[PDB]
Amino acid sequence: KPKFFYIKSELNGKVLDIEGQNPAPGSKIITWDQKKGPTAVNQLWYTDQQGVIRSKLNDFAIDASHEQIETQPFDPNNPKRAWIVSGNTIAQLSDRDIVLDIIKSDKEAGAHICAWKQHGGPNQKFIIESE
Ligand SMILES: OC[C@H]1O[C@@H](O[C@H]2[C@H](O)[C@@H](O)[C@H](O)O[C@@H]2CO)[C@H](O)[C@@H](O)[C@H]1O
Ligand SMILES: OC[C@H]1O[C@@H](O[C@H]2[C@H](O)[C@@H](O)[C@H](O)O[C@@H]2CO)[C@H](O)[C@@H](O)[C@H]1O
Structure with missing residues (x-):
């Protein structure tokens, strides 16, 4: 039912x-690096009926409880687990000044992601791409 995106x-x-x-x-x-086809499941995301980002793989939320972002089951009363599409950023629903951020602008595959104060840098800039 939802359409998925990278x-x-x-x-x-x-x-x-x-x-x-x-x-x-x-x-x-x-x-x-981007995968296409049935093995792309762990790179596909959707927004739930309230507009909140989940993984296709397990319907978990994005979680910023730790320095590095990870997956956790969605909890509607945990502000660390509600992330939204916001233009060309992924923003924290509860604090729009906090966005996803590729740590230290690491360009190598396998880089980790953090929640950081928005600064407009390229390491905070993400495009939503339909599957
Ligand atoms: O390492 C990140 C990368 O992992 C892929 O999964 C691999 C896994 O790393 C490897 O240990 C196993 O033998 O094969 C899997 C499939 O190639 C993911 O597919 C990829 O999306 C990344 O998450
Ligand atoms: O640590 C997360 C934070 O890093 C900034 O990049 C810094 C980096 O932390 C530091 O080690 C290096 O010497 O300087 C970098 C550039 O100022 C990022 O700018 C920020 O977006 C976060 O990713």
Whole structure:
């Protein structure tokens, strides 16, 4: 029922990816080279009926409880787990000044992601790309 999308970095054209296709909670979200087709499941995302981002793989939310972002089951009363599309950024629903951010602008595949104060830099710039 939902249409899925990639979250693609303007820093290097790599996409957000649940490391190793791991459906367990606490799996790191990293940058990785884009896959197409049935194996792309851990790079595909959608927004739920309230507009909040989830993974196609396990319907988990993005979680910024730790320095590095990871997957966790969605909890509507945990502000660290509600992330939204906001123009060319992924923003924290509860604080729009906080966006997803490729740590230290690392351009290598496998880079980790953090929640950071918005500054307009290319490491905070993401394009939503329909599957
Ligand atoms: O390492 C990030 C990368 O992992 C891929 O999954 C690999 C896994 O890393 C490897 O240990 C196993 O032998 O094969 C899997 C499939 O190639 C993910 O597919 C990819 O999306 C990234 O998350
Ligand atoms: O650490 C997250 C934060 O890093 C900034 O980049 C810094 C980096 O932390 C530092 O080690 C290096 O010497 O200087 C970099 C450039 O100022 C990012 O700008 C910010 O977006 C976050 O990613």
